[PDB]
Design a protein around this ligand. Sequence first.
Ligand SMILES: [Cl-]
Ligand SMILES: [Cl-]
Ligand SMILES: [Cl-]
Ligand SMILES: [Cl-]
Ligand SMILES: [Cl-]
Ligand SMILES: [Cl-]
Ligand SMILES: [Cl-]
Ligand SMILES: [Cl-]
Ligand code: NA
Ligand code: NA
Ligand code: NA
Ligand code: NA
Ligand code: NA
Ligand code: NA
Lengths: 112, 110, 110, 112
Amino acid sequence: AQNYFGSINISNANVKQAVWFAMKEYNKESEDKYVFLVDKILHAKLQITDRMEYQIDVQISRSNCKKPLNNTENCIPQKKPELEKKMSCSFLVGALPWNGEFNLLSKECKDV
Amino acid sequence: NYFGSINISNANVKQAVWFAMKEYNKESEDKYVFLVDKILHAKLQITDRMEYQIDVQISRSNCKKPLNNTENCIPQKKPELEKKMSCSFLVGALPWNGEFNLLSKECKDV
Amino acid sequence: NYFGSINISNANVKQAVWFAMKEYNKESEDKYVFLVDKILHAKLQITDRMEYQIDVQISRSNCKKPLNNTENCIPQKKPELEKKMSCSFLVGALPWNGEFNLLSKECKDV
Amino acid sequence: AQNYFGSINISNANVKQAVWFAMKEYNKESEDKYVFLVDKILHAKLQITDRMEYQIDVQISRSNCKKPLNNTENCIPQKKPELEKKMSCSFLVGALPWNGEFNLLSKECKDV
Ligand SMILES: [Cl-]
Ligand SMILES: [Cl-]
Ligand SMILES: [Cl-]
Ligand SMILES: [Cl-]
Ligand SMILES: [Cl-]
Ligand SMILES: [Cl-]
Ligand SMILES: [Cl-]
Ligand SMILES: [Cl-]
Ligand code: NA
Ligand code: NA
Ligand code: NA
Ligand code: NA
Ligand code: NA
Ligand code: NA
């Protein structure tokens, strides 16, 4: 049905910043002991209202990095089968990206 | 003229549309918010400022003004309130300084 | 050399052309403003500052200086005032810091 | 093995700023008499973690400009055979590019 969301390039620096922001907040809010990182950015859509709203679909996986990330470098996807975890997530990120203002409005993740 | 086509993908074109629609809705004598169906075309004229001439299709939403944020806005489904328009906006900017100004608006029913 | 071609679509090329043309017009003792017919080519060299060598076609407009708060500038239609040039500008910059300098200009008729 | 770095378009303005930053640091740290400049940016990968991490492959060459570019001569690749030198470099640049914050995390250059 009709809405005011339009597909947007995933190349866009603001989409990448929206994903950076969403994943920072996802990890802070999650009850998992491990950091999830981005396997792939799958799709992005933009709604223009009083703010910019990015609806972003990402594939994320459980890393071998324990929260909090701190200065840990080269986190890799879990290699232990019992800890391997892949999810498809949809994030709704509100922004005035020209003002560096981002807000995670909604999250939904499913196992894949 | 001195207008050249620019990509609608350009972050400053999207900010110019956001800015034009904020001013369109503030200035409108409507109960409802109009939102962007489609950005149709953009051209840029370079003078003492950047001027973006942007064509957009807008429609009346089911959201009453001022935009409340939490609500889900979609095009009107009620026949007497359905309204689609083709708009041309001229937005002046020094986008590197966060400065945008609506120079001109023109909307026609479609 | 260390100059590489870049897309004229790039936001920083458009800011570099804005800066070059503002300085070109400020330096010119013409009573009319010159605006860009087309941006032709654009190259970037990365040293201590970003350097953009941009090739543009410009023409004498029907607007006299200072540009008015309203804007209706088109190429001159009076034969004795018609003037088109191919220009090369070298713009040095830290575009993230709002720092631009017009290092060099070169213009040829038609 | 798996990691969280993904190839990105080298056209990206933040890749160009990352290379500007990396080359400034490369040249200040080098013991060469001459400035090295960029023949070509070859490839870029992005990891999104608590910061943006750019893994950038560049071809650099020894210029005819001696250090530190204070007389601002127009630099070209060396035309003297014994000074001609091309290298393939990998730079790892950590950044919050929306905040103008860049850090050179790693450099590695090889003759080609
Ligand atoms: Cl490392
Ligand atoms: Cl009404
Ligand atoms: Cl104005
Ligand atoms: Cl053009
Ligand atoms: Cl500065
Ligand atoms: Cl001239
Ligand atoms: Cl950093
Ligand atoms: Cl910072
Ligand atoms: Na922006
Ligand atoms: Na066109
Ligand atoms: Na203009
Ligand atoms: Na208009
Ligand atoms: Na390039
Ligand atoms: Na994190």
